[PDB]
Design a protein around this nucleic acid. Structure first.
Ligand SMILES: [Mg+2]
Ligand SMILES: [Mg+2]
Ligand SMILES: [Mg+2]
Ligand SMILES: [Mg+2]
Ligand SMILES: [Mg+2]
Ligand SMILES: [Mg+2]
Ligand SMILES: [Mg+2]
Ligand SMILES: [Mg+2]
Ligand SMILES: [Mg+2]
Ligand SMILES: [Mg+2]
Ligand SMILES: [Mg+2]
Ligand SMILES: [Mg+2]
Ligand SMILES: [Mg+2]
Ligand SMILES: [Mg+2]
Ligand SMILES: [Mg+2]
Ligand SMILES: [Mg+2]
Ligand SMILES: [Mg+2]
Ligand SMILES: [Mg+2]
Ligand SMILES: [Mg+2]
Ligand SMILES: [Mg+2]
Ligand SMILES: [Mg+2]
Ligand SMILES: [Mg+2]
Ligand SMILES: [Mg+2]
Ligand SMILES: [Mg+2]
Ligand SMILES: [Mg+2]
Ligand SMILES: [Mg+2]
Ligand SMILES: [Mg+2]
Ligand SMILES: [Mg+2]
Ligand SMILES: [Mg+2]
Ligand SMILES: [Mg+2]
Ligand SMILES: [Mg+2]
Ligand SMILES: [Mg+2]
Ligand SMILES: [Mg+2]
Ligand SMILES: [Mg+2]
Ligand SMILES: [Mg+2]
Ligand SMILES: [Mg+2]
Ligand SMILES: [Mg+2]
Ligand SMILES: [Mg+2]
Ligand SMILES: [Mg+2]
Ligand SMILES: [Mg+2]
Ligand SMILES: [Mg+2]
Ligand SMILES: [Mg+2]
Ligand SMILES: [Mg+2]
Ligand SMILES: [Zn+2]
Lengths: 119, 132, 146, 161, 62
RNA sequence: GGGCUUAAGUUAUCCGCCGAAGCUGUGGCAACCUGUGUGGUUGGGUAGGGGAGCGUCGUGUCAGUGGUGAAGCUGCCGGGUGACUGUGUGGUGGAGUUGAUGCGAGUGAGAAUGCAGGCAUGAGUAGCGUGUGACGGGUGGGAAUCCCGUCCGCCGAUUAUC
RNA sequence: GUACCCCGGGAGGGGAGUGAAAGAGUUCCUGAAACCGGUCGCAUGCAAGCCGUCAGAGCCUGUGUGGUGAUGGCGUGCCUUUUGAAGAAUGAGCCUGCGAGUUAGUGAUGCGUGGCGAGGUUAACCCGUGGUGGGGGAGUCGUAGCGAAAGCGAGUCCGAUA
């Protein structure tokens, strides 16, 4: 029972060439070269799906820092004040408030100022 | 599943628009050397193109000129158009059959030689289609 | 979805800083922050949201210690023996704009966007600047307590 | 089924070129398996697939296959099919009167039961057997079995407690 | 020396696109009876003449 | 690194914060243990051991299906934890082949300076094998490179003749 | 097996005919990939790029999802072989096809599973010209071990009936 490889073989090649359908040069034309980049692409995507948490937290923290420093309060004192006041609104909602509802963010800044240890 | 509106060169290149075309298959010259003149002749008026190609120094001018003349004649016969209001709407060169030959070299070696060939296609439409 | 600025959505302003007796390091950090717009809640690394900074009196920038004659600045033309060196005091006396731009660029990220943003820094060694039309507002370098 | 190994492919006796100096890979024969036109490495060779199944297993299987459709009431017994001379029309009837058309017939009489054998030979939905050749495959494939009287008698006589 | 690596498509095309020719310009024959296109400063292949509408000296017997 | 002593240096001390795929929260999957209502523990991994599968070809049987268009090829829209896939929807194509359950394998390729073919790269690049040709006319769709003629040059112990 | 007509010296094409189909036109079924081009959309001439990935404006499209991608972050190929390779260690220009754990023994030894069970099983061969079924117990393994062996035997051997 001789078996010809082509019908079964082309499936993974079509899959990989589809996955590599925006790459430059040989990486989008040649299966072997596309295969190497798809390994790197998968590794990068896995790494970046976990680094995305930190990237977005850093962005939120920077925006909160800017918005609170506009009110004469540093980010660390602002966060400690919120923690002491017991308001568990997170970095994300706080950044969205800073960009969108600056008055609500400033009210939270006042809450943190009042909840400061003052020591 | 095969049926009607079967594909055709006229349908692909013109698609119910007025005009005609001509193909020179198996031109015994290189596709790149033909493209060197096709790039110049593309987009011109047909009479200006043929008159210029009578003077173009490259050897590719002659086959391309004959193709343009044939396309002009086809248009004049099958659509009533006149030669003086046609312009070369499209023009391209594809690759045809290549022959492998051998050139003997020093120390008993043999070097490959590729005798290439080209297909030339020219599509001519009335000049009114230029701004359409 | 986190907010992201859209091209010209963030309006860029013009500040002017009098470098009179202000330490070069503080001036450069403040300028970099303003140029990149880190004081704005609309900040985004990939979109220029910063402001234009006009620095005046750059020839009177304060330096501590013996920096004015021992803190050196180097350039290389890319060919053997193509190094030139000049002290920061001489550079502030001669071409203060170059000194301030070097400090700010060193403190600013190494980006195409950072190169674009550094053009927004207009440094003049004297007390007068030609950008009255842009109407720069005075900016005071301050600190936030605790 | 058979293939030619690198030793059986024609030619390929000499080393194609020198081991070193040519810039080509080291080759030992033009009929090496990685060559086009070379020998097959582990291709098929002629063999027998017969298995030495124990007698008790083979017989018991036959008994179980027969017993399943004995309990399902798919065994009929006829004195014979066809009378005098032999047609296929007659037995087609006898069997259609029995039931359906995925059939097995037993006539055992290995030498001179030509009437029944040649009658049912050409149905193409009937399998005809001698009682001494029942075999499990055919019993399982059959949807019903019809024994001739002699067929059933001879099978029982050949194997009985 | 020998090419160390296969040149990329972008670089190969960057270099290859500069292998081209300019179109021959052609000028209308000054002879009113000819009106054909010929090379500048060259006798008209059709009328075989040269010069302005006046002069018009024969150059090629064609 | 910029820059920093007007510490952004050293040191003691206090108050905050940042910070990992660690921990916690939430949702899904899996292995194992346990009395079997719960729950607990665990799931980086090369050589390598164990377990369970996908896809290709042939084939027994049953159910089928196919010019109202099989295989193959090629789009789109989807699906699964993976190999992969749709009983979605087109195009091309023209004669086969699907599902269930067994059986048998020439059953899976990216590497062997692997083999065969096709085709790129270098590149319109190097070369076109010692040299003297010029012109008039002819032929022709097309002529430096064919024919004829006239000038001129070359060989001549050979570029001759046998 | 393309009459006839047109451009062409031809080659080739354009009409038309034949045919169910001619993009089945003889280089002729199907016609993949590398490779070479035309057209359209977006990006791209201040930029340092293992070519991706995450974030993300704008444009195009909206067949309201897709194409493209300014700009920011992070990020040193594949295989082999190595204490250790992105390695300036090896192999690979590219695609397509091919190319390596097979088979045979009433072999050796496990396991899963099925049959029979103090029993199990046949080999050659014979019959079935009708096969995959029946016969065939010659043998062979289990049924007692211990000893060089005679031998003795739930014992035996060394030993002195220790
Ligand atoms: Mg910060
Ligand atoms: Mg289909
Ligand atoms: Mg020789
Ligand atoms: Mg041999
Ligand atoms: Mg040998
Ligand atoms: Mg062979
Ligand atoms: Mg370059
Ligand atoms: Mg985390
Ligand atoms: Mg964890
Ligand atoms: Mg958790
Ligand atoms: Mg694991
Ligand atoms: Mg773990
Ligand atoms: Mg392993
Ligand atoms: Mg039917
Ligand atoms: Mg098939
Ligand atoms: Mg099956
Ligand atoms: Mg194989
Ligand atoms: Mg391959
Ligand atoms: Mg080599
Ligand atoms: Mg080859
Ligand atoms: Mg080339
Ligand atoms: Mg050149
Ligand atoms: Mg070169
Ligand atoms: Mg050169
Ligand atoms: Mg040359
Ligand atoms: Mg010569
Ligand atoms: Mg010559
Ligand atoms: Mg002569
Ligand atoms: Mg002489
Ligand atoms: Mg003499
Ligand atoms: Mg039909
Ligand atoms: Mg077709
Ligand atoms: Mg072909
Ligand atoms: Mg074909
Ligand atoms: Mg630019
Ligand atoms: Mg760098
Ligand atoms: Mg070593
Ligand atoms: Mg290497
Ligand atoms: Mg290298
Ligand atoms: Mg080595
Ligand atoms: Mg190599
Ligand atoms: Mg290879
Ligand atoms: Mg015996
Ligand atoms: Zn003229």
């Amino acid at each position: 029972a001789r078996v010809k490889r082509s019908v079964n073989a082309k499936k993974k090649r079509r899959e990989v060439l589809d996955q590599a359908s925006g790459y430059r040069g040989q990486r989008s034309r040649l299966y072997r070269k596309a295969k190497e980049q798809t390994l790197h692409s998968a590794t990068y995507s896995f790494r970046d799906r976990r680094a995305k948490k930190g990237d977005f937290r850093s962005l939120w923290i920077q925006r909160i820092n800017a918005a609170s420093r506009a009110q004469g309060m540093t980010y660390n004192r602002f966060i400690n004040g919120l923690k002491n006041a017991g308001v568990e609104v997170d970095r994300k909602m706080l950044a969205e408030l800073a960009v969108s509802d600056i008055n609500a963010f400033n009210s939270l800044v006042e809450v943190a100022k009042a909840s400061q240890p003052q020591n | 599943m095969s049926k009607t509106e079967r594909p055709s060169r006229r349908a692909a290149l013109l698609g119910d628009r007025p005009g005609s075309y001509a193909i020179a298959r198996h031109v015994r010259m290189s596709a790149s050397k033909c493209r060197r003149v096709i790039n110049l002749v593309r987009g011109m008026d047909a009479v200006d193109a043929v008159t210029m190609l009578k003077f173009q120094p490259q050897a590719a001018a002659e086959p391309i000129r004959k193709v343009i003349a044939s396309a002009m004649a086809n248009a004049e016969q099958t659509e009533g158009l006149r030669a003086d209001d046609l312009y070369i709407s499209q023009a391209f060169v594809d690759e045809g059959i290549t022959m492998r030959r051998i050139r003997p070299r020093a120390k008993g070696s043999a070097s490959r030689i590729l005798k290439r060939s080209a297909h030339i296609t020219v599509v001519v439409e009335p000049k009114e289609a230029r701004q359409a | 979805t986190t907010y992201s600025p859209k091209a010209g959505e963030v309006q860029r302003k013009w500040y002017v800083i009098d470098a009179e007796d202000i330490v070069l390091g503080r001036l450069a950090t403040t300028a970099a922050n303003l140029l990149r717009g880190k004081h704005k809640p609309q900040y985004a690394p990939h979109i220029d949201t910063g402001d234009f900074v006009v620095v005046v009196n750059a020839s009177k920038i304060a330096l501590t210690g013996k920096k004015a004659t021992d803190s050196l600045r180097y350039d290389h033309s890319g060919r053997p023996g193509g190094l030139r060196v000049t002290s920061i005091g001489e550079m502030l006396a001669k071409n203060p704009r170059r000194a301030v731009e070097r400090a700010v660029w060193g403190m600013m990220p190494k980006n195409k966007l950072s190169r674009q943003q550094l053009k927004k820094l207009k440094v003049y060694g004297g007390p007068e600047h030609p950008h009255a039309a842009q109407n720069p507002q005075p900016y005071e370098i301050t600190q936030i307590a605790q | 089924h058979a293939t030619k190994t690198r030793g059986q492919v024609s030619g390929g006796g000499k080393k194609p070129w020198r081991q070193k100096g040519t810039g080509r890979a080291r080759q030992g024969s033009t009929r090496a398996p990685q060559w086009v036109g070379g020998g097959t490495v582990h291709g098929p060779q002629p063999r027998s697939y017969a298995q030495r199944t124990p007698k008790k297993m083979v017989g018991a299987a036959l008994r179980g296959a027969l017993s399943d459709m004995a309990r399902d009431n798919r065994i009929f017994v006829v004195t014979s099919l066809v009378d005098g001379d032999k047609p296929s029309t007659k037995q087609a009837k006898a069997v259609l009167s029995g039931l359906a058309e995925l059939r097995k017939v037993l006539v055992v009489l290995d030498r001179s039961d030509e009437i029944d054998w040649l009658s049912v030979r050409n149905l193409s939905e009937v399998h005809v057997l001698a009682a001494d050749q029942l075999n499990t495959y055919d019993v399982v494939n059959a949807r019903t079995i019809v024994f001739s009287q002699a067929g059933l008698d001879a099978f029982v006589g050949a194997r009985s407690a | 020396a020998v090419p160390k690596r296969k040149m990329s498509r972008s670089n190969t095309r960057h270099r290859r696109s500069q292998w081209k020719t300019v179109a021959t310009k052609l000028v209308t024959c000054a002879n009113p009876a000819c009106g054909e296109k010929h090379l500048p400063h060259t006798a008209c292949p059709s009328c075989g003449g040269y010069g302005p509408r006046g002069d018009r000296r024969q150059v090629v017997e064609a």
